[PDB]
C-alpha cells in the first residue's frame, strides 16, 4: 500500500495517544499524537510521526488541503495548513505522508503538534524536542541563498517509495471510548453502534460484548459490567504510552516517508582576514564572519593548530616554518606559506 | 510442448457424439504417452473422464471413452447433453504428469435459448446526485444471442452516451446480460426518453426509460 | 473427487510472489499427487507441472520456471501453484487436478489471477430495481450494478445473498483498469418489493461493497 499511499493509509486508522501536556498540563488521548522522531539528518531534516493521515487522503489522494484527522471522534479529513508544527520555531515543511511529515526548522526545547481540524484551532500536543544543526563547512552561517561553496551532506530525498523500513501495528486498539454504555437503572443498555465494544462480564457476560450492536444487562452498572471501545479498521503502529489490552498482537507494516540520502550543501565560506609578512613571521587578521573553524596549519611541523570557531577579529601570526603554515581556515581551501628571507 | 492434433474446433448435437478427435502429430499413441481425451464442465472445469487410453467418467454419460483412436486420443462420446457446452480436453501424459494441447471445445444442440429478458430501466437517482445517469438496459438468457444494442439515450443511437455490460452465456445457452445508458444528471434530465435497443435471435429487448 | 477450493481472482503486484492454493480437499490425498494446472489465456489446461499430496512433488514444465512455484500444504488437502514474479504478460487462470485415475483426475477450481497495474478505486454496487413509474410485471428485474473493480474482485449475491435464484450477472470487465458487470436478477410479483429482494455487491480485495436492498423509487 505505497504504489498508491492511500492503502497504507486505510490500513492505519490513526487514534489519539498520550497527550499529556496539550494544553497547560491536561493530558487524554491528544489527536495529534508524538509518535517518532525522524532526523538523522545532516540535511538539517526534522521529521515528525504521528497518529494523523498528515499526507494521506480519505480515499488515499494525496490532497494538500485534506490532513487527515483521526480519534474516537472519528477520523476526519482537516486542514492541511492548519496542522501547527511548532518547534519554538515555524515548522517549515519538506513534506509528508500519511503518519509522517519531513521539513527543516530550527529547532528549540519543545516541538509541538497543534491540533486544528476543524474542531479546534490549535491544541499544543508537545514533546522536549532536542534539534541544532551542527552544521557542515569550515564556514559557520547557515544561508543556503549566497553562492560561495558546494560540500556534501545527507538530507531526506523526498521520493514517494513504499518504504525503506516499515513501522506498524496489531493486537489491535482495544481503545480510549468508555462511555459507550446507555443507561438502564441497574440494568445497562447496550449502545451498539460507532465502532467495536470491547465489553466485560460482573451480571452477565452479555456485558462481554463486542459489537456495533446493542444489548440490555440486568442488575449491573458500572459495577457488575464492563465497557471499553474495542474495534478494528485501524493498524495502530506506534501506540506508546497507552497501552493496547493485547499483550499478544499480528501486527501490520507501512513505510517510511523522506528516505534519507545523499546531497550538497551550498555552504557560505566567505573570503578571511588579511595577512602580511613580517620580519620573521606572518599575520592574518581574520575579521568577522559566520563561526568559522578557523585552522592555522603548520603542516608538517608539530602539529598545534590555530584552529577554533571564531566570530570576532583575531589574530592569526603563523611565525612560519621551512615546513610552512596552512591557512585553511574557515570555508575556503588551504594556503601553504612558505618562510622567506 | 506438444501437439496431439486433431479437429480443435468441435461441433454437437442434441444427445450429441463427441468425437473428440486427436491423431498424434508425431505419430503413433500409447499409454505410456497417455493419449487421453476428458469431456470439460462449465466455466473451464476440465474433468478428465476418458483418462489415458483406459478409462471412462465418473457420473457421466456412459458413451464417453478416451481412448486409442487413430495414433492419438480418439475420444467417442455418444449421448452428450443439451446444455452440456465444455471444452473436451485431449491430455497426452508422458509417464509422468498430464500435459495439454489443445482440447476441442463442444457446443451442441438441444434447449436453444430465446430473446434476451428486458430489464430495461433507467435507474434509482444515486447517480443523478452525482451529476450522472447510468440507466440498466438488458437482457436475461438470449439464445442464439447475436446481440444488436442501440444505445443512446434521447432516443436515437450515438456512440456516446451507451455502454454495454458483458453478456454471459451459461452451459445450457442463455446468453442475456446488461448495459448502461450513462450520461450526466441534469444531462440525463435533459433527455428521459431514453433505452439500450437490444436483439438477440429474433427476439428484441426494450430498453426505455421514463424521467 | 478430491476437489479444488481455489485461490481468488488476484490483480499482480509487481515481481510479486504468493503460494496460489487450490485446496485439494476431499480426503487427505498425501500418497496422491496432482496436476498443478495453470489456466493458459488461450490454450485452456495448459498445466506448468504437478503437485503432491504429501510429497508435495511439483513437476516442472519448460516455461514456469521464473514466475513458478510448487506448494503443497497437503495437510487438511491444500496443493496450489506459487505466483512468483510479478509481470503483467503472465495472468491467467489457476487450477488444480487431483491423480485418481492415475493421471490428473480432480479437476480443481481455477482462480483469474491477473497481472497488471490497476486502479485505486475497487468496484461499487447499486441498487437498480422496478421503477417509481411501474415497471411492474410476473418479472420485476432489479439488482445491484458492481463497477470498477481495480484490482480484483468482484462478487455479487441477489436477494441480498439470500433470495438468489438465478440473479445474472456480468462479472468483473474492462473499463479504465477497473472490472465492472451488473448482477440483476428478477423478482417475482411476490418476490419484492416489500419482500427486500436486494441486489448486494462486493469487492473483497478491494473491499468496495454494499447491500441495495427492494426498494424502488415507488
Known amino acids: 500500500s505505497v504504489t498508491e499511499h492511500f492503502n497504507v493509509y486505510k490500513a492505519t486508522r490513526p487514534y489519539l495517544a498520550y497527550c499529556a501536556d496539550c494544553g497547560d498540563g491536561y493530558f487524554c488521548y491528544s489527536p495529534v499524537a508524538i509518535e517518532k522522531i525522524r532526523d538523522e539528518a545532516p540535511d538539517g531534516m526534522l521529521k515528525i510521526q504521528v497518529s494523523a493521515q498528515i499526507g494521506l487522503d480519505k480515499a488515499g489522494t494525496h490532497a494538500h488541503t485534506k490532513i487527515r484527522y483521526m480519534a474516537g471522534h472519528d477520523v476526519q479529513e482537516s486542514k492541511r495548513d492548519s496542522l501547527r508544527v511548532y518547534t519554538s520555531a515555524a515548522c517549515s515543511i519538506h513534506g509528508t505522508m500519511g503518519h509522517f511529515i519531513v521539513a527543516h526548522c530550527p529547532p528549540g526545547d519543545y516541538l509541538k503538534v497543534s491540533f486544528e481540524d476543524a474542531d479546534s484551532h490549535v491544541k499544543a500536543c508537545k514533546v522536549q524536542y532536542k534539534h541544532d544543526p551542527l552544521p557542515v563547512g569550515r564556514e559557520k552561517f547557515v544561508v543556503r541563498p549566497h553562492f560561495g561553496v558546494e560540500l556534501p551532506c545527507t538530507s531526506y530525498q523526498l521520493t514517494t517509495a513504499p518504504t525503506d523500513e516499515e513501522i506498524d501495528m496489531h493486537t489491535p486498539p482495544d481503545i480510549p471510548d468508555r462511555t459507550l454504555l446507555s443507561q438502564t437503572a441497574g440494568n445497562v443498555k447496550i449502545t451498539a453502534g460507532g465502532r467495536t465494544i470491547r465489553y466485560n462480564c460482573t451480571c452477565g457476560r452479555d456485558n462481554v460484548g463486542t459489537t456495533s450492536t446493542d444489548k440490555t444487562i440486568n442488575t449491573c452498572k458500572i459495577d457488575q459490567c464492563h465497557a471499553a471501545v474495542t474495534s478494528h479498521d485501524k493498524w495502530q503502529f506506534t501506540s506508546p504510552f497507552v497501552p493496547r489490552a493485547d499483550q499478544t498482537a499480528r501486527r501490520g507494516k507501512v513505510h517510511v516517508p523522506f528516505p534519507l540520502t545523499n546531497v550538497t550543501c551550498r555552504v557560505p565560506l566567505a573570503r578571511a582576514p588579511d595577512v602580511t609578512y613580517g620580519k620573521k613571521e606572518v599575520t592574518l587578521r581574520l575579521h568577522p564572519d559566520h563561526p568559522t573553524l578557523f585552522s592555522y596549519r603548520s603542516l608538517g611541523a608539530e602539529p598545534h593548530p590555530y584552529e577554533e570557531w571564531v566570530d570576532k577579529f583575531s589574530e592569526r601570526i603563523i611565525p612560519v616554518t621551512e615546513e610552512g603554515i596552512e591557512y585553511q581556515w574557515g570555508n575556503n581551501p588551504p594556503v601553504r606559506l612558505w618562510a622567506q628571507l | 510442448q506438444a501437439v496431439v492434433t486433431q479437429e480443435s474446433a468441435l461441433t454437437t448435437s442434441p444427445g450429441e457424439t463427441v468425437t473428440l478427435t486427436c491423431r498424434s502429430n508425431?505419430?503413433?499413441?500409447?499409454?505410456?504417452?497417455?493419449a487421453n481425451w476428458v469431456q470439460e464442465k462449465p466455466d473451464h472445469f476440465f474433468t478428465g473422464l476418458i483418462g489415458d487410453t483406459n478409462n471412462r467418467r465418473s457420473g457421466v454419460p456412459a458413451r464417453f471413452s478416451g481412448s486409442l483412436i487413430g495414433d492419438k486420443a480418439a475420444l467417442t462420446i455418444t449421448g452428450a447433453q443439451t446444455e452440456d457446452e465444455a471444452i473436451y480436453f485431449c491430455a497426452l501424459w508422458y509417464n509422468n504428469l498430464w500435459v495439454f494441447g489443445g482440447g476441442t471445445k463442444l457446443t451442441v444442440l438441444g434447449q436453444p435459448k430465446s430473446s434476451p429478458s428486458v430489464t430495461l430501466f433507467p435507474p434509482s437517482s444515486e447517480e443523478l446526485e452525482t451529476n450522472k445517469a447510468t440507466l440498466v438496459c438488458t437482457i436475461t438468457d438470449f439464445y442464439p444471442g447475436v446481440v444488436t444494442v442501440d444505445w443512446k439515450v434521447d432516443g436515437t443511437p450515438v456512440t456516446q452516451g451507451m455502454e454495454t455490460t458483458q453478456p454471459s452465456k451459461q452451459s445450457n445457452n442463455k446468453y442475456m446480460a446488461s448495459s448502461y445508458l450513462t450520461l450526466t444528471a441534469r444531462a440525463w434530465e435533459r433527455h428521459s426518453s431514453y433505452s439500450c435497443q437490444v436483439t438477440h435471435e429474433g427476439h428484441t429487448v426494450e430498453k426505455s426509460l421514463s424521467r | 473427487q478430491i476437489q479444488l477450493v481455489q485461490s481468488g481472482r488476484e490483480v499482480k503486484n509487481p515481481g510479486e510472489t504468493v503460494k496460489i492454493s487450490c485446496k485439494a480437499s476431499?480426503?487427505?490425498?498425501?500418497?496422491?499427487?496432482m496436476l498443478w494446472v495453470k489456466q493458459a489465456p488461450g490454450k485452456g489446461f495448459r498445466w506448468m507441472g504437478l503437485?503432491?499430496?504429501?510429497?508435495?512433488?511439483?513437476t516442472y514444465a519448460e516455461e514456469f520456471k521464473g514466475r513458478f512455484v510448487f506448494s503443497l500444504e497437503i495437510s487438511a488437502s491444500t496443493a496450489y501453484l506459487q505466483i512468483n514474479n510479478l509481470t503483467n504478460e503472465d495472468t491467467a487462470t489457476y487450477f488444480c487436478?487431483?491423480?485418481?485415475?492415475?493421471?490428473?483426475?480432480?479437476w480443481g477450481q481455477g482462480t483469474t489471477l491477473t497481472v497488471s497495474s490497476a486502479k485505486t478505486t475497487a468496484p461499487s454496487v447499486y441498487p437498480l430495481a422496478p421503477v417509481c413509474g411501474g415497471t411492474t410485471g410476473s418479472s420485476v428485474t432489479l439488482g445491484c450494478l458492481v463497477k470498477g473493480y481495480f484490482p480484483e474482485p468482484v462478487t455479487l449475491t441477489w436477494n441480498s445473498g439470500s433470495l438468489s435464484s438465478g440473479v445474472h450477472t456480468f462479472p468483473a470487465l474492462l473499463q479504465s483498469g477497473l472490472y465492472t458487470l451488473s448482477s440483476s436478477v428478477t423478482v417475482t410479483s411476490n418476490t419484492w418489493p416489500s419482500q427486500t429482494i436486494t441486489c448486494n455487491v462486493a469487492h473483497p480485495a478491494s473491499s468496495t461493497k454494499v447491500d441495495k436492498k427492494i426498494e424502488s423509487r415507488r
Open positions: 487436478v487431483r491423480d485418481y485415475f492415475i493421471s490428473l483426475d480432480y
Open positions: 503437485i503432491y499430496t504429501n510429497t508435495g512433488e511439483p
Open positions: 508425431i505419430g503413433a499413441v500409447t499409454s505410456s504417452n497417455c
Open positions: 476431499g480426503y487427505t490425498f498425501t500418497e496422491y499427487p
